[PDB]
Each structure stands twice: as C-alpha cells, then as structure tokens.
Amino acid sequence: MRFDIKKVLELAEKDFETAWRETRALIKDKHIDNKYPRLKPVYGKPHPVMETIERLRQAYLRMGFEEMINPVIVDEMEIYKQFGPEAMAVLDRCFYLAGLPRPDVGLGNEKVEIIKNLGIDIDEEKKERLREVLHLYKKGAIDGDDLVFEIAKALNVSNEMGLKVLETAFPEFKDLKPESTTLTLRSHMTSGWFITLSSLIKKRKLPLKLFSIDRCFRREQREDRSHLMSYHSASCVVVGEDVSVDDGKVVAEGLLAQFGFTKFKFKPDEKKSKYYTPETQTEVYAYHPKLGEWIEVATFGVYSPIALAKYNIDVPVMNLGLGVERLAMIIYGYEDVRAMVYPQFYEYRLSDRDIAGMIRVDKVPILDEFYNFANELIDICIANKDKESPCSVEVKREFNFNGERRVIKVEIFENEPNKKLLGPSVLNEVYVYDGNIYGIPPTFEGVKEQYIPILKKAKEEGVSTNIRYIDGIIYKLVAKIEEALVSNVDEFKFRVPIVRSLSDINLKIDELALKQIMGENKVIDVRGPVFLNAKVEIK
Amino acid sequence: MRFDIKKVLELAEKDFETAWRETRALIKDKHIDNKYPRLKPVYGKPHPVMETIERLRQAYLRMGFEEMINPVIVDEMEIYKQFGPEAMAVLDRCFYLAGLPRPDVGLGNEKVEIIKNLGIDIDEEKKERLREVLHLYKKGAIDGDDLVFEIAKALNVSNEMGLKVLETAFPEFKDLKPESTTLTLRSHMTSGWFITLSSLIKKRKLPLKLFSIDRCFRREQREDRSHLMSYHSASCVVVGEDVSVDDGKVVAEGLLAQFGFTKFKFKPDEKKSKYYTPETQTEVYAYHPKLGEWIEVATFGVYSPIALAKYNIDVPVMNLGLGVERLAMIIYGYEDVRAMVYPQFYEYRLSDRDIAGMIRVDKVPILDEFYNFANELIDICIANKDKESPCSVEVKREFNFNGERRVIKVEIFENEPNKKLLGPSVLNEVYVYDGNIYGIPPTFEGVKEQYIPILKKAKEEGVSTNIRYIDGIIYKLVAKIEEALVSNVDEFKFRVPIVRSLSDINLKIDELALKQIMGENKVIDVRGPVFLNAKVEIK
Amino acid sequence: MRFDIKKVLELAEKDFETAWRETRALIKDKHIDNKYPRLKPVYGKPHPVMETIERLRQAYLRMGFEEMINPVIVDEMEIYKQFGPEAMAVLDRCFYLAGLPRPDVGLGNEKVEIIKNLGIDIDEEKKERLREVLHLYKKGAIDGDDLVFEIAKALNVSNEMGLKVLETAFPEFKDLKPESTTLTLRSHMTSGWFITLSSLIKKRKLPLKLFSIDRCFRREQREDRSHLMSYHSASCVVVGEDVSVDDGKVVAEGLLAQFGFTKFKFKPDEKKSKYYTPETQTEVYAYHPKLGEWIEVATFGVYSPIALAKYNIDVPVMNLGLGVERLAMIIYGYEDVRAMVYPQFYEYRLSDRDIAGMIRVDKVPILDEFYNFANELIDICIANKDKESPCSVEVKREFNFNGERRVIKVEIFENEPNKKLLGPSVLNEVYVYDGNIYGIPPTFEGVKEQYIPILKKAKEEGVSTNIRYIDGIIYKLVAKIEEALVSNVDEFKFRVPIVRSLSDINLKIDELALKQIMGENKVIDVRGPVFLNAKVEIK
Ligand SMILES: Nc1ncnc2c1ncn2[C@@H]1O[C@H](COP(=O)(O)OP(=O)(O)OP(=O)(O)O)[C@@H](O)[C@H]1O
Ligand SMILES: Nc1ncnc2c1ncn2[C@@H]1O[C@H](COP(=O)(O)OP(=O)(O)OP(=O)(O)O)[C@@H](O)[C@H]1O
Ligand SMILES: Nc1ncnc2c1ncn2[C@@H]1O[C@H](COP(=O)(O)OP(=O)(O)OP(=O)(O)O)[C@@H](O)[C@H]1O
C-alpha cells in the first residue's frame, strides 16, 4: 500500500544520508505495461483553422472592432441590390436554397389494408387519429422529426411500427422532389453586411468598426489546393464620413502584423466587382514559404455609393475580407486546403515514438508476488550473464497461497563448456528508427560491419522501447510459472535459443503499427543469440 | 510644450513640499471637449454567441477531445443511410442545395447591332473574342466574378461597358432559374460525423474523442424565441468498444460544470430518431433563470449499429450535441435567440452615461490664450458670485498677435441694487438621470418642493456632465471675444438673464440622444436665474 | 469483440424496424463499476485569480495597451526618488531583500579527522581538491545547488556522502545569518514603471499606453479578508503631452465595463501619496453583492512632475492600478481573499453528486460469463418478485471452463406461506440528498408517515446511485458462485433477510465521503425487508 511515515522519519533521523539513499525502494517503478514510452500523454488538440479563427477574433478585437453575426441566408434580390446588373452573372457562384414540399396524402382503403396486413388493429378511431396526423403534416404543423412519433401515437403502436407504417403505407413520400426558392447562401460577408448596416447605422454613433468571422459558400468549378465549397471569411466594415481605401490598407496591415507578417503586398483586383466603388477593390498578398509563391489572403474595398444608397446608407464604408483558410495554410505550412481542413480523409502517419509505444510485452505475471519475482530474476540473470560455463544459477523461493505453501525452484543454467551463462544478445534493447524496428546490442562486438553504421544511427537518433530481450524473456518465464500453478504442473523446462522475431522475446506490436511498417516497406529486425536454458520445479 | 526638468528639480530641492504642491500647475487639465464623461473608452466588444463558442472549444479541449471539422454539405443519401426509411420524413427539415445553369447563348446579328448601338466598335475579331468568352462561360470555364472582365477584355472596352454589354445584349441571363440537386446542408453534426468516422476509424487508435463546434441548418416552420434557420452545434463523438449512454451523461456534466452549472436534468427523447440505438436518445435540460423555465441545451445518444454498419463502423459511438445559442441564452440572460444573435435588428438604448457624454459645449475659444483667459474668468466669476450689488468686476489684459497688441477689457457687472453679482443658479451642474437631463443647483434653497426629492435623487444616482452653467456661459463669452477680433468689432455687450434651455448656457446635445429622450418621452429641464451682464471693450 | 457488420446489414435489410429495435442488444451496457454517476467527468480547472488575470490582459489588450514586464526588485533609493521624503515612512511597507554570506572555512586536521572517521579515505590529493571546492564556494564560484556534488566529486565519494561530509565536518554553515541589502521588492507597479519609462520614453513615439499584470508585495500588519502579503496589480501607464486624470477615469471604466460592471464610483484618496500630483490620486469602487458593501478595486493618478523629473521624464503620465484579487472577489463572490486565493488550506465539501459517485458495489463477478449471468438473474428476480408463496424459481445453466463443464443450479425461493417471493423493499434505490444517504422504495405504502415527505423530497431533489437493493444483492450472490468454483464448494445457501446497512446490500462508501457524512452529522439510512432466500448447487 503506502509507506510508514513513522519508520521513514526514524530511519532518516538515525542517519539522513543512508536513509535518503535506501528510501528509494519505497518508490515502486511502474508496471512494465505503463512505463515510458508505452505511457502516452493525453491532451486536447485544436484544429488549425479554428485556432486561426480565434486568433483572428482577437486580432480584430484588439483593434477596437465590435464583433457581429450577420445573416447567412439572403434573398437573391439582395445580391441584385449590391452587385447591380452584374448579379445576373455573379449569382452563378451562389448556392440557392431548395426544399421538399409537404405531401398531400390520404387514408383508405388500400392503405388501411396495408396497415392491417402489418399486424395492426385499426379502429375507426385510430383511422381518424392518423388521418388527422397526416392532415397536420400536410398543413405544416408537424415536424419531420416528429412524424414517426405522431403516427405511432395515433395508432397506439410501437415507435418502430410507426415508421413501418410510414414507409410501407405511404411510400409516395419518396417521390417528393425539392423545389427551389429565391433564397441563397451568402458567398461572402458583404451580402450580410449591407443588410446589417442598413438597419444599424441609424441607431448608432459613427464611426463604426464591425467584424465577423463566419462561414461563406461559393459554387465553384471544383475544389482546389486553395478553394473550397465552404470557407471562413474574417470580415469587417469600417463606417464613417471620412473612410477611404487607406482604412482597408491599415486593417490588412494590423491583422497581418499580429500574426507575425512583416511583408505583404497590395494589388488591384481586375474584377472591379460592382459592389465596390471603381478602382478601390484591392487584393492583399502574403508569402507562403512551403509553396514558394505569394498567395491571396484578403480582399478589400469601399462600397459603391449606389449600393449604399439602395440600402439607405449615405456614408462611405470600407469592407475587408480575409480568407481564414488561406492565412491558416501559410501559418501551419499546409499546401492544400482540403488536406488541412479535413485531415481525416487523408493519412495519419505514426512517428518513431508512436510505434515505440505500440510495442507491448505479451505475457506478464498477474500476481504481484511473481511480478516482483520476475524483476529480481531479471537482475539476477543480468548479474550472471558472464558466468563461465558450465554454469548454473539457482533461485529457490517459497510462496504462500492462503493455507498452502509452495516452493518454486527456478534454475537457469548452461551445461556445455567454453560458453557463458547467457550469450551475446541478452541485453539487446529494442529501438525504433525511421519507421524501422531494430533490436540492438549495447556494443557492436561481433556485429557484421555493413550493419554497424545503421544500428549506431538508430541507437543514436531513434526512440527506445526501454525493453531488453532479457526483460520479455523472463516475464514470459515467470508468467509460465503462474500458468503452471493454476494448471497443476510441477515441472517444466523453458528455453530461448536464438532470437528471430519479436515473438521470440515475448513482445508484440499493435496491428496498426504493423500495417504501416509493412505498407512503408520497412523492417522489423529483432535477432540475436541468447541461449537461456531454465528448469523450474514446483514442490 | 513640456516642462523644465532643471527648474522643477531646483524648485523641489529648495523646498520639496511647496514644490510638490505648486508643481501641480505643470499638469494641464484637458480641453473641455475631452474631459470625462465626454471622454469615452474604446475597446473591442465580443459577441455572446461567439464567446460561448470559444468557451465551449476550451471546455471540450480540457476534457481531452480532439477538434475536427466535418463536411457541411452532404448528399441526401447520407441521410437515408443514417436515418433509414425515416429520412423520407426527416429530409423535410433539411435545406436542399440548388443552383443556376450556365446559359447557352450566341452572338449575332441582333446582338451585334445592340452592341454597336451602345457606341462600341466591333471588328470581326472582337466579335470572335466575345463569341469565345460566351462559349467558355457556357462550358463552365469562366467564373461569374470574372465575366464582366472577360467581356470587357474581349471587346477592348471599359469594365463598366463590359457590364453594359452583358445586361443590354444578353438579358436572357435573367431568365435562368435555379435547379435543385441531391446535395443538402447538414441539419445536425451527425450527418458529417458518420462520414468523418467512416474514413477515420480504420486509420486511428481507439478510443477516439472528437468534437466540432460549427454551423447547422434546419428548415423550420418559423423562427422562435429558441429556434433559428441556422444554429451552432457543439458536437462530439466518443468512439470505443465499451462506449455507452453514460459517456453522454458524463460529457454533458463536464461541459455544463465548466460553465458554472451545478444542476441539469436528463429526459428521454420521445422522437427516438432512427440514427440512435433504441432508448438511448436523451435530452439534457438546464435552468434559464430569466425565463423561469427549464430549457433544452443538448441531446445525446448512441448511434445505431445499423447506421454504423452502413458506414463500415463496427464499434459503438456516443454522440452529443449542445446548441450553442441555447446555452448562450442561459448564460447572458437573453430570452429570445433572434435578439441575442442579431442585435443589430433591434434597439440600442443609451444609458445615463451615454447621454451625459453626448452633451457638448457649443462655442469655445480656439486660441490657447483665450481658452485659458476663459478659465480664469470663470474662476473669477465663481469668486465674486456673491458680491453685493451694485457690483462690477473688471479684467483688463493685453494680448499680443505678432506685431500688434490689443487690450481686452472684459467687465462683468450688476447695476441694480439689492442683488448680488450673479444669481442663484450660476453654479448649477448638468446631470443625467433615468433618461432625463436636469440642470441642478448645489443646494435646494428656494427650490419648489415637489421638485426637491426628484432633483436630490438625480443628483445622487444620475451621471454628471461636470459642466456648470457658468462654464458654458463664459466659454461662449470669450469665444465671442475671438469672434470680435476677427470681425473688426471693438465693443459689445453680452448677457444671460434667465436660463431656459440647453442652448442658453451654450450647450447642445447629440441628435441621437435627443431622438431617444423624446422617444422615451422624458425631459430636458435646464432652468435657473443666472443674471450675468458683461461688456467688453477691445482697444 | 466488436459486432458483425454483414449480419447486421442483412438483418436490417430483411426488416428495418425489427432490426433497429433488436440491434440494441449489440450495444453492451457498461460494467456496473463504470455506470453513471460513478463515472465522473475529468477536465482541467482554472483558478479564479489567474482566470481573472487573463481576462484582464485581454481587457487591456483590447484597449490598445502594450504589455510589459517591469523590474520586480528595486533599490530603496528608487522609492525615495518617487515618494520623496515620504519614503522614510512608506518604505516600512516594503520588504527588504536579504541573503546569507558565503562561509570562510578551511580544512585542517580536526576536520580531516572527522572525514576519516566517516569511513572516507582521504589522500593529500583529495584533501587539496576539497580545499579548492571550499575556496571556490567562499569566492562565490559554486552555487549552493552544486556544492554537495562538488564535494563528492572532490573526495571521490557518493553524492549522499558528499552531503554527509558537508553537514558533519562543516556544520558552521548553519551559523550563517542573513545580511540585509538596500534592495526591496516593489509594493506596487509604479516602482517599476518609472524605471521602465525612464529608459523607454526617449526611444519611442508618444503617446504610450503600457500595461503589466504582475506580483507586488506589501508588509501589512496582518492579512485581511481583503489584504495579502503578496497581490497582483493590473497596472498601466498612459504617457503623453495631454494626459490628465480623465485618462484614468476612462481606463477604469473600460476595464470594468468589459467585466460587466455598469456601476462604479470615484473617491479622493486621503493619502495624497507624493508620487502623485496633488489632488489627482483617485480611488475606484465597485459593488460586491455578497458582502453588501462597496469595495476598492483600483487606484489611479498622475505622477508628480518632481518624480518624473528625477527620472528624466518631461511629460505627464497617468497611472492606474487595479487589484486583481479584489476584482476576483467580486466576480466569483468570495468574501475572503485568503480563502479564494489559497483554497487548499480550507475545506472541500462533497456535493450530493460527489457522494453518490463514491458509493461502490463491493463484490461483483470477475468472469464475463457470470457477470451476465448475474444481470439475467437480477431481471428474473425483478420479474418474479410477486409470485405468491410457496414459490421457487430455478435457473440451471452450464458453464464451460476449457475441458470441463459445470452445471450451476441457482434456485431462489420462499417456502413459508402467505408471502411473496421477494418482499416490499427489494427494488429500493439508493439516493443521496442534502448530505444524506437514503435507500428509498418506489412507492410509499407501509412507510411511516413522518418519513414520507422527506423520502419524497430526496427522491425528487436528490441524486441517485442508480443502484437498487436487488442489484448489489445478486452481484454478491453470483460473486459467491465464482468464489465457490475456485474454492471446491458444490453447494451453499445465501440469504438476505432484512436490510440494515449498506453492507447488507453489498455496497460500500468511500472513506472520504463517510468522514463528511459523519462530520456533518447526517444519516445513512438504508433498510427494508427484502427476504431473499437462495440455494446454489454446482454439479
Ligand atoms: N473557395 C474559397 N475557399 C477559400 N477561400 C476563398 C474561396 N473563395 C474566396 N475565398 C477568400 O475570399 C477572398 C475573395 O475571393 P475572390 O473571389 O475575390 O478571389 P479568388 O481567390 O480568385 O476567388 P474566386 O475563385 O471565387 O475568383 C479571397 O481572399 C479568399 O481569401
Ligand atoms: N432551430 C434551432 N436553433 C437553435 N438550436 C437548435 C435548433 N434546432 C435544434 N437545435 C439544437 O439542437 C439540439 C437537437 O434538436 P432537436 O430537434 O432534437 O430538439 P427541438 O428543440 O425540439 O428541435 P426541433 O424544433 O427541430 O424539433 C437541441 O438541443 C438544440 O440545442
Ligand atoms: N495587501 C493587498 N492585497 C491585495 N490587494 C491590494 C493590497 N494592497 C493594495 N492592493 C490593491 O492596490 C490598490 C492600491 O492600494 P492602497 O494601499 O492605495 O489602498 P488600501 O486598500 O488602503 O491598501 P493599504 O491599506 O495596504 O495601504 C488597491 O486598489 C488594491 O486593489
């Protein structure tokens, strides 16, 4: 359990130094299962696009901007107001919203028969209750969520039978086709900004500095290295009598400065979109190092007095919109938005450490007694690994299991002469380097010489499992002692000659790590002569 | 400018205390324009829904959850996979995505004539360049953004003439009607979670704890006190062999605990939506104090082995989705999501302080010389406000304007006997309380007695402008001296008898504050006898 | 073992509804150990003072202020520079810094003797090596950290014996007494601001807005509800040719506004500390609702031209310092800073939920087989609890343990007439309410009527363990079957007459929760007649 405070204090007062040294034994090492690097840290991991969104919220807030949420869904005529006649072309880029009608369907008599053939007992009453539920669904008074519930309730059947009725008796529901409206999703924040400002200016003291960082949707040819069907705009508007394009320049500098950028460039936007005053629509470029090229991070301009007029705004307004995903690409060094935004549809490679922590000890003794017995036994072997043969090393110990004592005589030996007790590889340690697994000896005596610079490099740069051959071997041995005791076996022999695989030293690897090791076509080279012979007797 | 370090140090070393007291004069008070409360703080203001989103990101991250972004747009068949046959009803709630076709239109000859009648010179070459631009637009190779540019480029005309051509020659663009697809917007995070997990499970080590806080869209009957067409889901999934509904209970407790909630309640969801294992769909309620009632903050459950199977997932998965806007309503005490999310479409009331800072001094002298002259003059009047009449107070001072000196004799007097120099109201101070503006005297001597408890309360609880009648009056007087000097006027009289309005003491109020003061039907009661007579001579 | 995707898809495709209902069995319930509320959420918990510090950094950053770190340690003469002669009094509140000298000690034969008697073999060489280590320590070239190491290294002894030599041969090290210096810890940020500003003004463009939120130290008579020896100042300075107190007023308003405060008060500071221009030192008050009284959150003023002059600053400077702990007290509703700041030295009460999650099931079967057997058995009893006596319920089941079959006949009975199989309390459920534990029946027939409103209240407001008597009872029974099999026992009887304690239904409570249950003088009332007789035979 825990340790004796009194005994520790007394031992320490007799002689502090001995006590400090000796008292280390009161601190147990962890179960082999849970030693580093098999012990992994757990922490929450943010998404780059969303951390960039928060950092942008704060870059705007720290410039005095007031945070807003604008309408997402806007009528097409809003886009005609802002873009003018150009909207008959620009509206190609916007998603229209469409939706299913309600079905007008009735009950009886063929349907009544279907429902009866389902095993349902229907009154006239039940038939009317359901006739009403269907009416209400036609008239829009019941949600789709709720229709299985209401049917079930109507006929007094199970929920699932409600669904059964729905799909069996009324399959014409499947013939509903979505019909489009005049409503669209905003393709940039502006489509909302006008609506928000039109209502807001008259109520507020100018100048206004507003911002919103929120989703926008474009209907594009395809998705790109730098384009998605849905993106995030880090948009703002500055409203005031004296506003000009320079305000956009200053907002772009202030946003980018806070992210570390010292160099960006402005460049006229050939499009000259009509919601912007002529010759004010400006592109902002920042440098993407991994791509080598300059990338468009933002766009700004001053709204056209014509659009502003159509929204009852009589004062100039500067707009700036920065694409969150672009900035994020630069920040985190991604070269493909699709792979940055949705990394789940791509691959998750395991590092040397990841793999080193997926290498586990197979059989280990379950009982504390024998686990410690194992550790001690390991240290014993490591102490006599060089005994000159013929050798033997006995360990007799008594274990008490309630009433009965059993005495375990584990003996590990070497009959044949001119040998040593254990062999050149018993202390080999399993490393992982560059996707490879190597069981490496502490010194390269007798190692083939092409191999040595590789193993030296893995031993230097790679990640260790901190498991030696001897460790897994002995845990296997003592686990076999436990196994023996519950199996009514009094004697057995156990031997590890030349080690050829992970299995041979009682280790295994998580299948996910194997799949990669193979897939990347790398090696698991665990090998060595480890001639360990043991006999155990259980009296 | 700035002050003399040497002179200050010397004055201080002669006698520290006198020096510390006297040296206060080296610190100028601010221009009356910029004194508190006319001086307002400026800081960025977060939006409650977005601060709640960040706090939720961190509540999830602090539980070890991994942040994700899921597809927003999903095919309808995804919903059939998750919801089963019920999707023929549930899909009513989802928005379908629709979009405009490209137009197939050609050039010539009537269009060629329109273009010519526009003032454009068209070659055969220009005609072919544009015929190609229109082809490419048909074939989807030119964006809507870019079409005015390309037309303009084709015909070598101005940008705007490009647009002119577009809308005049090809108005059939306006006849494009949006045609619907099979693509929908997700109505809750699950519709994305399945897609994400289906691809992600095989690549990753279980258990997984994922989360995303992102927009969802529902097609509802109407928007409510608690329902919007677009909302934010604070969703998560826990994936593992041993996952059960209890995981949802623990996620809901852990999310709500971090926000301060000590009391929430669970309740079965009658819907029993089919993407959830039977009898696991659970509602989470938390208490909204301003509304008095319990409100639904979240929903969770365990996905159905049938849906999981249709996505190649063979291990149970718990889903929880919390509505950000609901939680926000509880947190910030709003009772109407529409008013919380989009407060720009509602009203912005001005506090007592807001109004007190929108009360400005009208005329003030522009020249430093005369501004200080004014301040001194004010203090002079405040010193002789009780001189027994007949009174007079002269102030002769010489001002130098490059070459020429002028000597200003400002005299403020009181001819008639049994009076005092100034009158009972000269030190009245303008306060704002409960939407009202009151000019209040320092003591209630002679004040009508119904009024006294009101004015006492305004003076106690209200916000002061820190402007007294005498202040605005004298700034007006000296401003008139300046005015005089540039107007070639050597003499004038200036008098303030009984004060009746803000104007009478040289103040005015920002129109936005007036509009409210009137709208709320409150008063501006600035009144008092302040009999100040002055003559000024400029020699 | 996960579930069969193919079998599921096929079952679902035969009949979706049956399959949806039936596949619930593929979602295994959690081990009783890990069911809610024993399953707790785990998340990181911020400290109120530090969370307030961060929110304050952001309130300052959002006003355009530039964040700084100022010297913490400052010479006393700095304080004389700022405070003038008043510093001969003010310096009482400041901590002086002191430190102990290096010892001058030599070796020589009396010590050499001690070291030998310690068991250490000392050469002349070792003696000289250690003589140098002691020299270098006198001359300041060895850190205290490092001295035990160096000593050991010198004598070629263990680390611990290096320490032994140190404490045994040179115990005069203990006679070192701390000598004070002229260095002090800052008692407010100002003591650093001057230093910082003195260096910074010449290098920068005015106006400057700086802020720092960092520790300050005071020597107070004692610590208060509102005073600690060390506190955090959220300080700032505004530097510019035109600053006055009004800048302090807007900074205080802007700081407090962002925290939700609409209400604060200014009040002259009687002290008129000499580092502030006369009559500018201002106190800021905010309302602490729980304390009922107004509390001092901040102080501001304009530095004295004398102090600024002694630092070569020729331009006015407004300083404001808000005490973080005060603001935190208001925000989180603490009434005692010492208890808010250092809550570990105070008490941690367990909520009802906390205690309900510390009630554990004692004995539960280890083998999956018998665990499920147990659940099945529970449901069987719950199904036959009302069988009229004489009753019996047999459950014969055969279990396979590698080679051998064993057949377990569990028989649950009631021989005596006029009774039922189980008894009125068998389905009682354990609740926690207001610090009490109650085992409560689903219905109140036969309950003494004094008790009923209490138990009704606990059942409504309290927190359930979601464990019924029958649950723990049967888990105990089957656990005993397991014990039997391992113990070579083929028959036993098992009976639960009247329930009197938690132990009687195989439950126990965590020691920490009991300590409180007792300390707070509350009850653990679980009792009921639950007459369950069972016989078990193992063939
Ligand atoms: N599909 C998209 N994905 C991500 N970000 C986008 C997308 N479309 C536009 N943006 C962002 O919005 C801003 C304005 O878009 P704009 O159309 O002006 O330039 P573009 O990159 O040529 O886009 P398009 O392909 O629509 O012409 C850009 O700075 C970019 O940051
Ligand atoms: N229109 C909406 N606006 C805001 N939040 C919503 C909206 N619809 C659903 N939510 C959130 O998603 C969760 C699940 O919605 P669910 O449909 O299960 O319940 P509901 O409130 O009855 O919605 P509905 O009206 O669609 O039936 C709720 O906790 C709520 O937080
Ligand atoms: N010991 C302290 N603990 C916590 N905060 C303090 C302490 N001393 C001062 N503060 C903070 O610093 C500001 C200035 O302190 P000041 O000494 O002017 O007032 P005070 O509360 O009377 O302090 P004291 O009584 O220690 O002189 C206060 O607003 C308070 O917020």
Numbering used by the authors:
A (entry chain A), B (entry chain A), C (entry chain B): 11 to 549
Question: Could you pull the original sentences from the published paper?
Answer:
More recently, it was reported that a third protein SepCysE (SepRS/SepCysS pathway enhancer) is necessary for coupling the consecutive two reactions and for enhancing tRNACys binding. Thus, the SepRS, SepCysE, and SepCysS ternary complex (named the transsulfursome) is responsible for the whole process. In the present study, the structures of the binary complex of SepRS and SepCysE, and the ternary complex of SepCysE, SepCysS, and tRNACys from Methanocaldococcus jannaschii have been solved. On the basis of these results, we propose the scheme of the tRNA-dependent cysteine biosynthesis by the indirect pathway, where multidomain SepCysE binds SepRS and SepCysS to assemble into a functional unit (transsulfursome) and mediates the transfer of tRNA substrate between the active sites of SepRS and SepCysS via flexible linkers.
During the study of the quaternary complex SepRS-SepCysE-SepCysS-tRNACys, we serendipitously obtained the crystal of the ternary complex SepRS-SepCysE-SepCysS. In the electron density map, whole SepRS and the N-terminal helix (Met1–Lys24) of SepCysE(N-helix) were visible. However, the remaining components of SepCysE and SepCysS were disordered in the crystal, although there was enough space in the unit cell to accommodate the entire complex. SepRS was organized as a tetramer with 222 local symmetry (one of the two-fold axes is crystallographic), as previously observed. A pair of N-terminal helices (N-helices) of the dimeric SepCysE wound around each other to form a coiled-coil structure and were tightly bound to the SepRS with their two-fold axes aligned. Most of these residues (Leu9, Ile10, and Ile17) plus Ile14 were clustered with the hydrophobic residues in three pairs of loops ((loop 1: 376–380 ILDEF), (loop 2: 411–414 FNGE), and (loop 3: 494–498 ALVSN)) locating at the interface of two anticodon domains of the SepRS dimer and contributed to the formation of the complex together with some hydrogen bonds. Whereas deletion mutants of each of the three loops of SepRS showed no significant effect on binding, the double-loop deletion mutants did not bind SepCysE, suggesting these loops together contribute to the interaction with SepCysE. Likewise, N-helix deletion mutant SepCysE(ΔN-helix) completely lost the ability to bind SepRS. This structural and mutational evidence suggested that the SepCysE dimer tightly binds to the SepRS dimer by inserting its coiled-coil N-terminal helices into the interface of the SepRS dimer, which reinforces the stable architecture of transsulfursome. ATP was observed in the active sites of SepRS.
